[PDB]
Amino acid sequence: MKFTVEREHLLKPLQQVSGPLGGRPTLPILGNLLLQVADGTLSLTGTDLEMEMVARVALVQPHEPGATTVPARKFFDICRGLPEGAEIAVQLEGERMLVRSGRSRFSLSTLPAADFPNLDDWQSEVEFTLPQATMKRLIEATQFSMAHQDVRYYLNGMLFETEGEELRTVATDGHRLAVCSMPIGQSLPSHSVIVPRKGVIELMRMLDGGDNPLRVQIGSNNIRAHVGDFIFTSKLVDGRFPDYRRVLPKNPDKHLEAGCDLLKQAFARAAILSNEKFRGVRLYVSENQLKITANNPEQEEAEEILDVTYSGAEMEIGFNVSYVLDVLNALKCENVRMMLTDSVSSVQIEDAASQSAAYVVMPMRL
Amino acid sequence: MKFTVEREHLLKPLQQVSGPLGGRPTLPILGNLLLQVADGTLSLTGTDLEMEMVARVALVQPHEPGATTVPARKFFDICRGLPEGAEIAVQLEGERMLVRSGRSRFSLSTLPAADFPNLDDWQSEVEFTLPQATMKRLIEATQFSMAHQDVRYYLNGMLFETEGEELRTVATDGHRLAVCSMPIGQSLPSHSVIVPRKGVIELMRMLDGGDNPLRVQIGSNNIRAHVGDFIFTSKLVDGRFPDYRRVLPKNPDKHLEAGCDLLKQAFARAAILSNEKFRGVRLYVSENQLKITANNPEQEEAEEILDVTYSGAEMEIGFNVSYVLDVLNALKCENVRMMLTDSVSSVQIEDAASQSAAYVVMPMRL
Amino acid sequence: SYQVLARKWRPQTFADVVGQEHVLTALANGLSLGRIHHAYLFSGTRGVGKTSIARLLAKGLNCETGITATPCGVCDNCREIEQGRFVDLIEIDAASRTKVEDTRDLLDNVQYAPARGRFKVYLIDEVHMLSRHSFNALLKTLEEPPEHVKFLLATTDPQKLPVTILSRCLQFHLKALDVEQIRHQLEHILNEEHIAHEPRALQLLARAAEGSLRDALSLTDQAIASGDGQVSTQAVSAMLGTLDDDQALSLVEAMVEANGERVMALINEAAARGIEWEALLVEMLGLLHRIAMVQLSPAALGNDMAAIELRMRELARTIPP
Amino acid sequence: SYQVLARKWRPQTFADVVGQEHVLTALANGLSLGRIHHAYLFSGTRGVGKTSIARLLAKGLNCETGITATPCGVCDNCREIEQGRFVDLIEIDAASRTKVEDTRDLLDNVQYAPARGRFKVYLIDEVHMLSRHSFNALLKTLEEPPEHVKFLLATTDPQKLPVTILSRCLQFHLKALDVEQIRHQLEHILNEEHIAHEPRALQLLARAAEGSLRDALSLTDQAIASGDGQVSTQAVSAMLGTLDDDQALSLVEAMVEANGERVMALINEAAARGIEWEALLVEMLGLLHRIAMVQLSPAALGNDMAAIELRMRELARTIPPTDIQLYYQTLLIGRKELPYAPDRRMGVEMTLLRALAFHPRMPLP
Amino acid sequence: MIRLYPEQLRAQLNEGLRAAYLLLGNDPLLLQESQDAVRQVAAAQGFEEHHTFSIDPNTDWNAIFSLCQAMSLFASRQTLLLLLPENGPNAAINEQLLTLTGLLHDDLLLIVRGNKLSKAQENAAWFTALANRSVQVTCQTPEQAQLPRWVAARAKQLNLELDDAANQVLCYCYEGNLLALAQALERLSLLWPDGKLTLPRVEQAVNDAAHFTPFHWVDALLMGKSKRALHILQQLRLEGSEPVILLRTLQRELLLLVNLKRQSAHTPLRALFDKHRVWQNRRGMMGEALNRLSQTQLRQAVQLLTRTELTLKQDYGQSVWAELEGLSLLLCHKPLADVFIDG
DNA sequence: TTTTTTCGATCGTATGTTGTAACTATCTC
DNA sequence: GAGATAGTTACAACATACGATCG
Numbered sequence A, B: 001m002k003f004t005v006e007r008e009h010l011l012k013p014l015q016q017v018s019g020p021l022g023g024r025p026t027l028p029i030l031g032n033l034l035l036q037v038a039d040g041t042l043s044l045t046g047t048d049l050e051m052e053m054v055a056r057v058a059l060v061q062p063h064e065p066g067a068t069t070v071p072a073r074k075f076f077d078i079c080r081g082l083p084e085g086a087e088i089a090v091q092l093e094g095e096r097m098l099v100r101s102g103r104s105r106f107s108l109s110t111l112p113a114a115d116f117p118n119l120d121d122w123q124s125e126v127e128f129t130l131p132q133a134t135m136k137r138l139i140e141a142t143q144f145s146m147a148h149q150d151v152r153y154y155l156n157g158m159l160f161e162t163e164g165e166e167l168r169t170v171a172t173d174g175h176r177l178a179v180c181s182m183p184i185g186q187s188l189p190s191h192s193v194i195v196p197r198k199g200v201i202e203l204m205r206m207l208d209g210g211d212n213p214l215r216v217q218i219g220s221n222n223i224r225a226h227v228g229d230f231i232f233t234s235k236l237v238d239g240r241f242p243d244y245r246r247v248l249p250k251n252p253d254k255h256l257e258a259g260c261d262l263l264k265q266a267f268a269r270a271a272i273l274s275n276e277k278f279r280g281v282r283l284y285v286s287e288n289q290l291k292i293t294a295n296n297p298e299q300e301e302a303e304e305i306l307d308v309t310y311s312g313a314e315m316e317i318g319f320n321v322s323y324v325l326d327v328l329n330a331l332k333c334e335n336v337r338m339m340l341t342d343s344v345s346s347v348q349i350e351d352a353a354s355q356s357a358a359y360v361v362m363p364m365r366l
Numbered sequence C: 001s002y003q004v005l006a007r008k009w010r011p012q013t014f015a016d017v018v019g020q021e022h023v024l025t026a027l028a029n030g031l032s033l034g035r036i037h038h039a040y041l042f043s044g045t046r047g048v049g050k051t052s053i054a055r056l057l058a059k060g061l062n063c064e065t066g067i068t069a070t071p072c073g074v075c076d077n078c079r080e081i082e083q084g085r086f087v088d089l090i091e092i093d094a095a096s097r098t099k100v101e102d103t104r105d106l107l108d109n110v111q112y113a114p115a116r117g118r119f120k121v122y123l124i125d126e127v128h129m130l131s132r133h134s135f136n137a138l139l140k141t142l143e144e145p146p147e148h149v150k151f152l153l154a155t156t157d158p159q160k161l162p163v164t165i166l167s168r169c170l171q172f173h174l175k176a177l178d179v180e181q182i183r184h185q186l187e188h189i190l191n192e193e194h195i196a197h198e199p200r201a202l203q204l205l206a207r208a209a210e211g212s213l214r215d216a217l218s219l220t221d222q223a224i225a226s227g228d229g230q231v232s233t234q235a236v237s238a239m240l241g242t243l244d245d246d247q248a249l250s251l252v253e254a255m256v257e258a259n260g261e262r263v264m265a266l267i268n269e270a271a272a273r274g275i276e277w278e279a280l281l282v283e284m285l286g287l288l289h290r291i292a293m294v295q296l297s298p299a300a301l302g303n304d305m306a307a308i309e310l311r312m313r314e315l316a317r318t319i320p321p
Numbered sequence D: 001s002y003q004v005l006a007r008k009w010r011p012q013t014f015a016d017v018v019g020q021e022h023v024l025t026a027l028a029n030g031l032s033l034g035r036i037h038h039a040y041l042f043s044g045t046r047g048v049g050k051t052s053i054a055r056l057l058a059k060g061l062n063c064e065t066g067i068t069a070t071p072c073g074v075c076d077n078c079r080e081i082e083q084g085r086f087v088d089l090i091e092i093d094a095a096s097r098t099k100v101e102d103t104r105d106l107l108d109n110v111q112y113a114p115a116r117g118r119f120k121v122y123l124i125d126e127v128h129m130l131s132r133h134s135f136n137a138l139l140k141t142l143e144e145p146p147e148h149v150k151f152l153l154a155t156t157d158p159q160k161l162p163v164t165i166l167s168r169c170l171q172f173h174l175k176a177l178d179v180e181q182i183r184h185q186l187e188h189i190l191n192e193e194h195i196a197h198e199p200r201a202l203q204l205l206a207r208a209a210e211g212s213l214r215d216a217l218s219l220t221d222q223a224i225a226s227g228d229g230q231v232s233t234q235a236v237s238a239m240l241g242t243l244d245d246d247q248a249l250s251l252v253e254a255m256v257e258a259n260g261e262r263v264m265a266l267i268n269e270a271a272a273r274g275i276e277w278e279a280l281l282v283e284m285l286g287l288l289h290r291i292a293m294v295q296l297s298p299a300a301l302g303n304d305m306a307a308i309e310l311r312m313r314e315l316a317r318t319i320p321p322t323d324i325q326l327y328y329q330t331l332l333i334g335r336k337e338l339p340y341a342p343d344r345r346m347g348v349e350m351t352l353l354r355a356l357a358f359h360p361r362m363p364l365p
Numbered sequence E: 001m002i003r004l005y006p007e008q009l010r011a012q013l014n015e016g017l018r019a020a021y022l023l024l025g026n027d028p029l030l031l032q033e034s035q036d037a038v039r040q041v042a043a044a045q046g047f048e049e050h051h052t053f054s055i056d057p058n059t060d061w062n063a064i065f066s067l068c069q070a071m072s073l074f075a076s077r078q079t080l081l082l083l084l085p086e087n088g089p090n091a092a093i094n095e096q097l098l099t100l101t102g103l104l105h106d107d108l109l110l111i112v113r114g115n116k117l118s119k120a121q122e123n124a125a126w127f128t129a130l131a132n133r134s135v136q137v138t139c140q141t142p143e144q145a146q147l148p149r150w151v152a153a154r155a156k157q158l159n160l161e162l163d164d165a166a167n168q169v170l171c172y173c174y175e176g177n178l179l180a181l182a183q184a185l186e187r188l189s190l191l192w193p194d195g196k197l198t199l200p201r202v203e204q205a206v207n208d209a210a211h212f213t214p215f216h217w218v219d220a221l222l223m224g225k226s227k228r229a230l231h232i233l234q235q236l237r238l239e240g241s242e243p244v245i246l247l248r249t250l251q252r253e254l255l256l257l258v259n260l261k262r263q264s265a266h267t268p269l270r271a272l273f274d275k276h277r278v279w280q281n282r283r284g285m286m287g288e289a290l291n292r293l294s295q296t297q298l299r300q301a302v303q304l305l306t307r308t309e310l311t312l313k314q315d316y317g318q319s320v321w322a323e324l325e326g327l328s329l330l331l332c333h334k335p336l337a338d339v340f341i342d343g
Numbered sequence F: 001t002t003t004t005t006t007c008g009a010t011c012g013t014a015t016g017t018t019g020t021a022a023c024t025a026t027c028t029c
Numbered sequence G: 001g002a003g004a005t006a007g008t009t010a011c012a013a014c015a016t017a018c019g020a021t022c023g
């Protein structure tokens, strides 16, 4: 079982797999990583019983099938110690593996690979492939609305829905809603799943500049994404999610159109004297006029006036400036359309150019 | 009290006077800039109970005399947030400040200007003028030698001495002493003062490479610097600075002229090969030869041999790598001259071309 | 649609406050004379009305008609204070604002003059929940506050406050309201609300209130809900007055007379009626205790159970202690 | 615009200070002889005058005329110090500045020489609230104090401070003011304020002060407010009754005297206040136990019961031990039975009546 | 190693200096006085620079080693002070001290201040190596018996006339706290320049600041001084000491007394003391305690202790101190009506 | 010539270390 | 003269140690 490894190739995958691994083992073998050889590739896998990450590296020299477990810390230290450019020779000799770095021979303890909690058989309920750009855009536009720590555990993640030839990401936290839709060009069964925060953030982290498409397959209880030479597998909350379309206001009478940059600057300027803890502002909308008022616990007040395209009845609405600013920043467009019904109803925000993504904010009642 | 200015003109003085001001001041009023309109000028003052910065701006618009205070951070943020090219009109109404910019309005709370602390007037002892480049060179030459934090407070600052037509800067930290001198060009009474680290840092920050002359006034316990439209006042630390003249060797018998770049690169290579902390570096000098060896206990003695222009009696001396590296880096030239008397004696280093800058270092005891 | 009685019937003037005559008189005298201190602490049981008195004092201090012991209640300042919108009435929730960072911020923002009113009144509620660091930070500010700053404190457990804080304040301890005052207040409120009521229902509600008037109002709301718009004796007895029936006294008399058959018949009748057994034992114990008190002091029995007074007195004359 | 008596009336000279004779005499002698320690610490109870004495010492040190025991109070330095506007007087409030970065900025400013005064006094109040690293920095500064810098420290609980700071400072402990001194000070203040008063009212206020003159002034203000500009004995009695908290000892005394009416009145008063009944029983049991201990030996009581020491000692002298044991047993049984009683007030009343009249029958072998 | 006492350091320093000095003890006053005297003598001999460090694994030894190896620009004969941790040196600290010992030279003067070292802590390679050229100072707080002698010596040194009654009052009020005694003496001298310290003068300028330990309380109980025991218990309560330590300290002595009294009827007392390995000085006190009370006592005391422990743990009560006072009186010759014992 | 105390669950203050995002400076196009 | 890449500073989140209260 002779394996020749180059430090340059081995460096980055080792750090990637060791990333999720933490100091606290919680199990004798959890800290250890599984190294296996199949055909002409070597797979290094690491998991913490919640998420699994496996990286594959091509092999050219002749070899035979095998699989073992190696501690992560010792292997990382050995790799770091060796000078850059060194070639590592790894052999299997009994219960302890042999590492031959030049004239230095090291014996590393090996635990049986049959006891490693690694998934053996995978069944895909729905599988597809997409460019990294689309997935990155959807995640970036829908991530900021996820709840962090809430009693409603089903709100602590992102809802991925495949419908016909459309992929939809939904995020909610009880006060704001973000929905994004994008065509995929393939017909898929109607299916909805929930991915927790950890899976989404890990997927975003591992995702890089669009070079090759990534393939995502979702089964009964798990989701596995393969990109380049990495595969990341996670499990799902499975707690059911509220229907977003119900949350969206029905028949919004009042429509307003404005410039994204002007509104962003106005909100940023008004937020200077806004309440630090609450960050509350008041909007008075009248015919082709929008007045933004901010108050402070120190009795300070700020007022701004802007010109917009509006023709409905005068309205006064309270809002949280931080959420509006986040929505405007994520939207990243030129013209913004706001749909509202009354002073005690949620307000929807979209782009005049296209309706690919929508946001909803619930006003604060004083 | 009212005035009207432009954001472009007012941006620079706000940044200049709001630099040191920050954190939580001992007195709330110390956190507010003092704005005074009078004699067709606007004066912005910022103090920290030990240093004061004053900026003056000319007015070309109708105005009323007055004085008030305004929080630094809020005012700076409001001024910076406005669109470029906008004009700011400020007024005082009741116990509040009203700011207008086009169709944008802001209201701020203020405090009476009477309660604002005022630095006691003092009569200057020695007043003169100096070009910016000379002071920049002095500060650069005599900055790294200061002690960042020492029990002996008087060593924290630096010694500014005037004698005849010479201005001298002295810095020390108990192990190395750096002295620089420049010709003032004017005859002044002899006088020595001590400047704290904060004062010299602020003075260096104030200079912007311009050609405007610097007016320096030194009094009994305070130092004032005028640069263009900026006034900086600082207090002098009380103490008894040690005499630099006695520390300098009276007559070093042994001299060695070498190349600055060669020594600098040799020391850098030794440090890279000797990244381990603790201990110093032992250098043995012989006729046209130098041998540098790391003083590590067990690490391999990767001694380096270099050629120099030396022909005196050979000897071995230990030095701290950091001090020699800092001296070489600060004295940026092509050739250096090192003078010494014996093994147990301070070694002096200067430039073979000019003797303005000198650095004397005590050898590490062994 | 109807708002709760406790919130609706909040005293908006010193005349509407029930009881607490000593504190109201002291505050009125202080305001009239002009001897205004900068630190008031209010203590007592629950529902006595410490917060209401603090709000009334805040209205009195900041009134456009001047510092008066009888605020007008019509000027915009009074209206804003009543609606909880006045800019110069900083209300602090000490229960949530426990960390010393909030106290440091408050003390840092205490020097600026008030916007509209003549004082900047800081009303800290549930002050007993603050950590020691907050108390220590507040010490010096309470010692020498700015002239335009007043501090008002209210708590239920003043025993856990630092001794220095107690020394640095004017203490006012409110006592629990008696039965008669609670009954009169309930009668007045029901008359204003146009709801039918009976005297015994009010008596039972007042007795169950146990000092706290907010408890009385909550029980009145429960009685109104149960009676379907009316406060009847049966409706109140259904939820609260399940006890206090002549059956307990009859059982006590039968036991005293060693009439086993009568006791058994009474037990069977109570079982048929569906009487809680623990409540029956509680009532018997209470009757025995009150008879003992009558034996000790003839004035122990008040008018509350006057209907049975005579009978009780008889049991006091015959039964040895 | 009447001002608070505590705030308005503050000491301005060592003569004005009431009591604390030893500390004032020591400071005056030290100033006269030129023996000035580099660091002073003041300790004591609330309202004893630590801050006032510290400010008077600061005035004395920097007085224009000289380093005098009694500052003139007329020169500019004295007036500025009194108004808190003196250039070289720094009043650090450690309570709101426990952070290290806040204390370091002042210990660094210690370097600069005083602008006007001879010494750059650093008055640190509530020093016991500083953090460990702040204590380390203060220890360094006290280890190397410049000759032109002095430190004044005030703390109610010096135990919290590290022993090193205590060793590197001269301590002064201020005794609790006596009843007569507080009464005389109140009488003088009222006479200077042109407010009518009665001797019994002053005596009651002094007793309620409990050695803290500030508490005495606060109670005087409350009495003036209640009495409508007059310190009448009726108003003071009413206030004390409203805020009285010695009901447990009064109940014990009534039980000893076997007076049912007084017991009932005290129970009603406690019910009005809302005092927890189980806590009341626990307090009564503790009082009985301590009275028994006093009977065993007079040294049972210390400073903890100084407020009610006289009554406890009188009860110990009068009551035979056997009656105390019987009352203790009866109250213990009542506490045991309280949970099962329908009402805690009812249980307390039953227990008190049983102790008054019904003697338990000691079980036979 | 030259062993000395704080009262014999001035003569040794005048005779000459030494490579290193070690100050171990408990009393801060004597330790700081010795430190000040040593530093003053060193400065008189030319030691100008002084540096202080607190021994701590968090603290970096690299700076200390560099300072030891480095030489000052315009100074010589540096002084280094090390404050040992209260718990005591650790193996890593021992290795660091061993490394430092080699760096020591003539100019460097090392002064170590810290708590007294135990038998295991004293046994150290660096300590043994330095013993050849080290001076150690024993700083133990004097016992109540030795306190009046120290107070009289202090009064004589400061030229103060102190009466026997005043000496006893000062010893009682400030027992176990020498710093308070010194400060009180200074304040009294300032108050009266004449120096005639009569009893009323001391009584009118003294406060209670005594410091005690549970062992003192147990010793007072064995002696039978009810007033002293009550005072010690009150002081312990005021300073905020957990009663668990008091209970466990009392339990051992109570059980030992019970066992000895049970076995005393058949064996000589000396044989029992030898078997139980009791301290020689404690034998007289133990015998007096055994002869003072009979088996009737020391049995109800066990019941009181058990009931107090149960109240503390099961019920989490707050009347522990009252029960402790009652038990203290019971151990002393007192009636103790026994209703509280709940037999 | 030497002796080391109950335990579980919850709340608050202060310091030190690491990682990510936002803003600034320098070199090459 | 402007844009892209690399470096520095500031803010937020996590980890460790110490102290206090009630069941």
Ligand SMILES: Nc1ncnc2c1ncn2[C@@H]1O[C@H](COP(=O)(O)OP(=O)(O)O)[C@@H](O)[C@H]1O
Binding pocket: C005, C006, C007, C008, C009, C010, C011, C016, C017, C018, C019, C020, C045, C046, C047, C048, C049, C050, C051, C052, C154, C213, C214
């Ligand atoms: N003295 C009183 N007179 C009339 N109503 C009162 C009184 N005290 C309390 N209440 C009623 O009880 C309710 C709650 O009182 P609250 O402000 O909570 O007092 P506390 O602060 O003492 O709990 C109020 O809404 C008020 O209607």
Ligand SMILES: Nc1ncnc2c1ncn2[C@@H]1O[C@H](COP(=O)(O)OP(=O)(O)O)[C@@H](O)[C@H]1O
Binding pocket: D005, D006, D007, D008, D009, D010, D011, D016, D017, D018, D019, D020, D044, D045, D046, D047, D048, D049, D050, D051, D052, D154, D213, D214
């Ligand atoms: N010895 C004293 N003589 C006169 N007044 C005193 C004395 N001690 C305290 N006071 C009064 O107490 C008030 C506040 O004192 P305070 O600064 O709280 O002292 P401490 O710092 O000891 O608490 C002062 O206005 C003063 O009149």
Ligand code: ALF
Binding pocket: C045, C046, C047, C048, C050, C051, C154, C155, C156
């Ligand atoms: F609001 Al409260 F007792 F003052 F319930």
Ligand code: ALF
Binding pocket: C143, C164, D045, D046, D047, D048, D050, D051, D154, D156
């Ligand atoms: F001002 Al204080 F104790 F109340 F020092």
Ligand SMILES: [Mg+2]
Binding pocket: C050, C051, C052, C125, C154
């Ligand atoms: Mg309330």
Ligand SMILES: [Mg+2]
Binding pocket: D050, D051, D052
């Ligand atoms: Mg004070």
Ligand SMILES: [Zn+2]
Binding pocket: C062, C063, C064, C065, C071, C072, C073, C074, C075, C076, C077, C078
């Ligand atoms: Zn009004």
Ligand SMILES: [Zn+2]
Binding pocket: D063, D064, D065, D071, D072, D073, D074, D075, D076, D077, D078
């Ligand atoms: Zn004066």
